[PDB]
């Protein structure tokens with residue numbers, strides 16, 4: 207029986223059908239050596255074009271021969287897939303319109319929920335599955351770091367056979383993105399393939415932000431600056447990220463994408479202005495610095511070289527007022543407990559069940575030189591506290607926007623929510 211070396215057993219993602227994005231079932235490998243599941247072969251090849259959906263090679267003769275002999279399936283590959291992914295196969299076992307656009311887009315959306323990529327998010331704007339909104343954060347290794355960029359995705363009716371149309375809604379200073387948000391990227395036009403996904407497109411866009419292609423520009427002036435005055439390009443990129451993409455300008459740490467994600471949990475249909483987001487970022491940075499500094503002193507005074515979740519917990523009690531401290535302590539403890547009792551995951555935040563960045567918080571705790579060593583639980587606890595406080599502030603700020611007949615949180619709604627809440631005013635009144 208066909209067996210593979212263990213190192214060469216294909217992953218689940220490598221066993222997906224390039225057309226429907228479901229697991230390959232009864233895989234049909236065409237003479238061009240491109241594969242698709244039998245339902246997709248029946249719907250897109252046998253019934254209609256009689257051509258390979260990937261390379262357009264004709265396969266009518268091949269199909270005639272092997273349909274008569276019931277030898278369309280690649281039994282060697284089918285054996286391997288059934289052996290290593292039997293449950294995924296079982297869910298497709300009892301079935302005969304595979305390959306349709308609506309099904310493919312829905313499958314990609316479901317896949318995103320199970321496996322989000324690199325702090326990106328994408329989903330339907332309303333009830334039209336063919337129109338999506340996407341959110342990407344500016345890569346850390348780029349002058350867009352800390353920014354939140356919104357994009358629109360328009361799926362064509364014959365997706366995945368034609369590429370999706372992706373454009374920036376947020377203004378950005380980039381040689382390959384113009385004032386309308388049009389993107390010059392190979393994956394969107396010349397190098398599109400039905401097996402590519404929105405996830406891979408967003409990852410490719412993030413990589414473009416890290417490393418532009420100045421030799422094929424949409425804005426020649428920006429490419430010229432990138433090629434002759436990189437410092438000026440970086441400076442202007444950072445400035446635009448602050449002006450339009452909720453950046454910090456590069457001086458302070460940005461949490462805008464995490465604030466936004468928390469906001470969508472407590473108030474899905476409510477937005478936040480850039481000025482208000484700058485205030486939210488000032489709170490998080492100040493709370494971080496107050497807790498981290500207190501924990502630094504608690505480790506030193508007690509002759510401990512490490513800041514652990516115990517110093518974080520004590521610092522929270524010392525710095526926050528009663529009920530806020532009690533809930534924060536409960537949230538940080540819950541996150542450290544969940545983190546310790548969970549498997550290593552894609553991100554430490556996911557292992558802790560948090561939106562805020564555990565890994566980044568840990569890096570900041572070490573970069574600030576608050577102590578010689580920082581335990582793994584400290585950033586989990588601290589990130590959970592910052593997330594809880596952000597959630598409590600956005601909860602009240604959103605309630606102030608609803609009461610004011612507004613759908614967008616602005617500084618007025620934040621200053622109102624904080625002043626009206628006794629404990630929050632005591633915690634943040636001086637920061638404002």
Ligand SMILES: [Cl-]
Pocket residue numbers: 208209210211215286289
């Ligand atoms: Cl095997």
Ligand SMILES: [Cl-]
Pocket residue numbers: 210211212213
């Ligand atoms: Cl082996």
Ligand SMILES: [Cl-]
Pocket residue numbers: 232
């Ligand atoms: Cl079978």
Ligand SMILES: [Cl-]
Pocket residue numbers: 264265266267268
């Ligand atoms: Cl042929």
Ligand SMILES: [Cl-]
Pocket residue numbers: 272273275276277278279
């Ligand atoms: Cl067959």
Ligand SMILES: [Cl-]
Pocket residue numbers: 290291292293294295
């Ligand atoms: Cl399985």
Ligand SMILES: [Cl-]
Pocket residue numbers: 348349440441444
């Ligand atoms: Cl920079």
Ligand SMILES: [Cl-]
Pocket residue numbers: 383384385386424425
């Ligand atoms: Cl332009």
Ligand SMILES: [Cl-]
Pocket residue numbers: 372373387388389
């Ligand atoms: Cl466009």
Ligand SMILES: [Cl-]
Pocket residue numbers: 425426427428
């Ligand atoms: Cl130009």
Ligand SMILES: [Cl-]
Pocket residue numbers: 519520523
């Ligand atoms: Cl304590």
Ligand SMILES: [Cl-]
Pocket residue numbers: 552553554555564565
């Ligand atoms: Cl991580």
Ligand SMILES: [Cl-]
Pocket residue numbers: 565566569
């Ligand atoms: Cl980092």
Ligand SMILES: [Cl-]
Pocket residue numbers: 568569570572
């Ligand atoms: Cl680190």
Ligand SMILES: [Cl-]
Pocket residue numbers: 569573
């Ligand atoms: Cl860093």
Ligand SMILES: [Cl-]
Pocket residue numbers: 513514515516580581582583584
């Ligand atoms: Cl720890």
